[PDB]
Swiss-Prot record:
Protein name according to UniProt: Probable esterase KAI2
Induction notes from the record: By red light.
Top-level taxonomy: Eukaryota, Viridiplantae, Streptophyta, Embryophyta, Tracheophyta
Gene: KAI2
Cellular compartment(s): Nucleus; Cytoplasm, Cytosol
Disruption phenotype: Increased seed dormancy. Long hypocotyl phenotype under red, far-red, and blue light.
Pfam families: Abhydrolase_6 (PF12697)
Active-site feature positions: S94 (nucleophile), D216, H245
A biological process from GO: photomorphogenesis
Effect of mutating G132E: In kai2-1; loss of function
A GO cellular component annotation in the UniProt record: cytosol
């Protein structure tokens, strides 16, 4: 199918119990490689890539469509409808947590639970909210992307992944970052880092499990609490004693058991 080719959709197993996993900026569905082995016995598992990932065709990246996170949420519902999925657990890494939230506002019936890893509704600080970034440092970030994309990827990957700067996960993320087309990377980085989901959190109704590393470049721990306090749905937080924004890839021994408990157990 067109949709499923374009998003590199992969479906493993069958049956009603279904889990759909959405990745964050700069990576692709391979971020889930240490989680999926533990899901396939119990669930139909659905993997897909966001439009604009380096594994996707840049001719399909419609700048107007993806200038709002809504564009991605429409892609997610389309995939679910294409696959005839009437209900799933959705696991959203980084921006995909907010993409799943938006999709659940339009179609809450499609989701029984959202499990967020490394989520944030707002990165920019204001006098009454800490998201982790001042606008001036975002401006410098974007200028670096603009001036030398390879150099930016090499410097950003170790910061994002955390841990040892020479690790396999840092190398993997370095590689997936650099596989994006530089103009798409710049555009999507701006859209995500300038986003603001805070105002819609009270309207969420699907239960949410809010998971993050205690040390995350892009997600201060107070953001987990902000999500918990302001989401309209039932929610639970668990901060993991791990480092990094992609901790399911880089620290699976400590992280995967936590994710599995939240998938397998309801609030």
């Amino acid at each position: 199918g067109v949709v499923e080719e374009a998003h590199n959709v992969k479906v493993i197993g069958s049956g009603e119990a279904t889990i759909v996993l959405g990745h964050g900026f700069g990576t692709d569905q391979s971020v889930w490689k240490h989680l999926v082995p533990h899901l396939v016995d119990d669930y139909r598992v659905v993997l897909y890539d966001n439009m604009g990932a380096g594994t996707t065709n840049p001719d399909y990246f419609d700048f107007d469509r993806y200038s709002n996170l809504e564009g991605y949420s429409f892609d997610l519902i389309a995939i679910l409808e294409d696959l005839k999925i009437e209900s799933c657990i959705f696991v959203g890494h980084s921006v995909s947590a907010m993409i799943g939230v938006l999709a659940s506002l339009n179609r809450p019936d499609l989701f029984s639970k959202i499990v967020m890893i490394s989520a944030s509704p707002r990165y920019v600080n204001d006098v009454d909210y800490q998201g982790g970034f001042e606008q001036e440092d975002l401006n410098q970030l974007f200028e670096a992307i603009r001036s030398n994309y390879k150099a930016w990827c090499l410097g950003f990957a170790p910061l994002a992944v955390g841990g040892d700067m020479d690790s396999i996960a840092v190398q993997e993320f370095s590689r997936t970052l650099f596989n994006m087309r530089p103009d798409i990377a710049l555009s999507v980085g701006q859209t995500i880092f300038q986003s603001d989901m805070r105002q819609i959190l009270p309207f969420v109704t699907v239960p949410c499990h809010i998971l993050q590393s205690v040390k995350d470049l892009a997600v201060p721990v107070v953001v987990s609490e902000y999500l918990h306090a302001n989401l309209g749905c039932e929610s639970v937080v668990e901060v993991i004693p791990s480092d990094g924004h992609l901790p399911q890839l880089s620290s699976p021994d400590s992280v995967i058991p936590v994710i599995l408990r939240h998938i397998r157990n309801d609030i």
